[PDB]
């Protein structure tokens, strides 16, 4: 029933409004196509929005904290892998303001 909210959180994230800085997170990070020789060495557990939406559909999340853990690991991963002055970092924080806000104003 809280997952009725995470569904609305996920749609908000995936909406056109945010498309300018959400696109790095639509699909799993493609290490081979971008030449990130070191990526899967640094990031043990990759995550993206497509993958969140799939786990949401196979109902692989029991409650809201499990969903939020995947959403945050997604951001944590960009932070870990990328230097502080890269564009992808800033996109990550913009998207994360949207998530942390909408996630905090969850009824319960």
């Amino acid at each position: 029933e809280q997952l009725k909210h995470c569904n609305g959180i996920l749609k908000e994230l995936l909406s056109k409004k945010h498309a300018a800085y959400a696109w790095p997170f639509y699909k799993p990070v493609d290490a081979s196509a971008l030449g990130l020789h070191d990526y899967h060495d640094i990031i043990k557990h990759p995550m993206d929005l497509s993958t969140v939406k799939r786990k949401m559909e196979n109902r692989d999340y029991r409650d809201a904290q499990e969903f939020a853990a995947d959403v945050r690991l997604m951001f944590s991963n960009c932070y870990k892998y990328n230097p502080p002055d890269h564009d992808v970092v800033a996109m990550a924080r913009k998207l994360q303001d949207v998530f942390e806000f909408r996630y905090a104003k969850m009824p319960d």
Partner: peptide, 15 residues
């Protein structure tokens, strides 16, 4: 290789 995706100093904003 190194460290990012190639967007060092790209984009707009961030102080």
């Amino acid at each position: 290789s190194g460290r990012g995706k190639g967007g060092k100093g790209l984009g707009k904003g961030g102080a």
